[PDB]
């Protein structure tokens, strides 16, 4: 698994108030570490993980200035896009922006990205060459031509290849005891009534980190993915995660079924059954 540093920003227009709101969050891997909210009084970039608090005032001042300027540009972007699409001035719209870097095994950039969505749909994205952009429609073509004229890709390529991965490496060191710790899942299978003709087996994985995990059910060697309910992986609230996978099986046939768990905290894939 490549580590990553990622910033996720949401800009929302608020015509009834005459303004906009911009929220940004930063993550290393699955761990949030900073936030910014333009509705906050005196708004600043703020810490959200303990290990970032060792950064000095220059870091917080620079982060604040950078995210504040970005909030101002995105406030204007909401108006610009409303005009490109000839939308009413009364409606709220959403512009999301996400950029970040994944770290290769050699300490270089494995992949960088910088993209936007408007009202949930892809708008404009930096291609993996970091030299060119892909636009989703005629509006985004206007933006793309602007950004080709300005050589906006150079600003992003330089960041992604340089400071993004160097920052990431620093944060991985700062937070090594949590960020670089894999915690394996605690696992068990529960049994619940379903009907006359069925019982539910639920395979649980609790307390694991990172969030990536595989839970599958088999019956005597055959995978059951088509008939199982697999919930979205969910946060515990303490930096770990939870997941379950459930299947309705015939009454009395529980021993034919095995749950299979893969996670980077386990030494070997686990097989378990209801007991």
């Amino acid at each position: 698994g490549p580590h990553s540093l990622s910033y996720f920003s949401t800009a929302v227009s608020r015509p009834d108030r005459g303004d906009s709101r911009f929220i940004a969050v930063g993550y290393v891997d699955d761990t949030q570490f900073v936030r910014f909210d333009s509705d906050a009084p005196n708004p600043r970039m703020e810490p959200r993980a303990p290990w970032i608090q060792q950064e000095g005032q220059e870091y917080w001042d620079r982060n604040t200035r950078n995210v504040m300027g970005s909030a101002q540009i995105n406030r204007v972007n909401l108006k610009t896009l409303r005009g490109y699409y000839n939308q009413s001035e009364a409606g709220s719209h959403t512009l999301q922006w996400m950029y970040g870097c994944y770290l290769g095994p050699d300490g270089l950039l494995l992949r960088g990205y910088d993209q936007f969505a408007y009202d949930g749909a892809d708008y404009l994205a930096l291609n993996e060459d970091l030299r060119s952009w892909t636009a989703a429609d005629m509006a985004a073509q206007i933006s793309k031509r602007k950004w080709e004229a300005a050589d906006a890709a150079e600003h992003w390529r330089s960041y992604l290849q340089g400071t993004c991965v160097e920052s990431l490496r620093r944060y991985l060191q700062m937070g090594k005891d949590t960020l670089q710790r894999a915690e394996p899942p605690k696992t068990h299978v529960t049994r619940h009534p379903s009907s006359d003709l069925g019982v539910t087996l639920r395979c649980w994985a609790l307390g694991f980190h990172p969030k990536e995990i595989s839970l599958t059910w088999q019956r005597e060697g055959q995978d059951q993915s088509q008939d199982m309910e697999l919930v979205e992986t969910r946060p515990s609230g303490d930096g770990t995660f939870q997941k379950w996978a459930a299947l309705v099986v015939p009454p009395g046939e529980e021993q034919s079924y095995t749950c299979h768990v893969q996670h980077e905290g386990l030494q070997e894939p686990l097989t378990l059954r209801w007991d």
Binding site: T10, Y27, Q96, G237
Partner: peptide
């Protein structure tokens, strides 16, 4: 409530706890 964030498919998520 957690700070607003979103997934790779642009859909939002929040934790209230």
């Amino acid at each position: 409530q957690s700070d607003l964030s979103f997934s790779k498919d642009w859909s939002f998520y929040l934790l209230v706890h």
